[PDB]
Design a protein around this ligand. Structure first.
Ligand SMILES: Nc1ncnc2c1ncn2[C@@H]1O[C@H](CSCC[C@H](N)C(=O)O)[C@@H](O)[C@H]1O
Length: 230
């Protein structure tokens, strides 16, 4: 009898999800987004891609909670690896996220900090546990770690190094921190999943286009597993 929200940043990331669920989906348009509301194993699921960035992901998450009353939010998308032990197509679940492009240093504030907020945002302990359990049941090398979210596609060793030293981030993306932040403000458990589709290096743009499809599917599958266990 639950209500579960599922989000992707791109249409490419949620089409595999709608496929895998295989149920009739009702399409409700709202705020520039199209929500796919169906039913599945007695769980009401609302799926959608937010479009790219912090503004887009924040808007959609807030509508998904205030309009559809979803009780849990799962995110599935692709990301860029910042550390060497996280490889293309690997899976990672974010323990904590940060907004790496936030800079109020002119007020002598650490980077990533905003008054009345926090540098790190935590995700659901129960959902991350569930994710870990499942990964062992199918011998999947699921990884854990901090994820940096900003409104810039990271494609430079230089920035890559800034993110690992400053926040000790493992992967970089563009919608993680937004989604998790909003869920926290509304007290909704959030889980952020990401498949590595590139290395955030000079060759990142290229590496991204090639693995978009494979990565988006590794991610969609795992997540469908979690919705089954719910
Ligand atoms: N290295 C990286 N730096 C920032 N975001 C990355 C990233 N690798 C993957 N991402 C993620 O996947 C998307 C990359 S932006 C996609 C651009 C697309 N080719 C176009 O031109 O329309 C974002 O949703 C972001 O969350």
């Amino acid at each position: 009898g639950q209500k579960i929200g599922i989000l992707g940043a791109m249409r490419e990331e949620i089409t595999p999800i709608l496929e895998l669920f295989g149920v009739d989906f009702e399409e409700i348009p709202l705020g520039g987004n199209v929500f796919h509301k169906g039913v599945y194993h007695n769980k009401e699921i609302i799926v959608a891609y937010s479009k790219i960035g912090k503004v887009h992901s924040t808007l959609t998450t807030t509508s998904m909670i205030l309009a559809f009353g979803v009780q849990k939010v799962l995110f599935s998308g692709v990301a860029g690896s910042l550390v060497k032990d996280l490889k293309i197509n690997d899976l990672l679940v974010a323990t904590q996220l940060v907004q790496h492009d936030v800079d109020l240093s002119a007020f002598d504030h650490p980077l990533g900090f905003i008054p009345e907020s926090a540098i790190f945002i935590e995700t659901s302990g129960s959902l991350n546990a569930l994710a870990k359990k499942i990964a062992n049941e199918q011998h999947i090398a699921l990884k854990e770690g901090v994820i940096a979210s900003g409104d810039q596609f990271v494609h430079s060793k230089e920035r890559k190094e800034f993110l690992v030293s400053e926040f000790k981030a493992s992967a970089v993306e563009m919608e993680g921190a937004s989604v998790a932040f909003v869920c926290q403000k509304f007290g909704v458990p959030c889980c952020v999943l990401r498949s590595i589709s590139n290395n955030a290096d000079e060759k990142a743009g290229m590496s991204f286009d090639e693995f978009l499809e494979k990565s988006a599917h590794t991610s969609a599958k795992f997540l469908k597993s979690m919705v089954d266990e719910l």
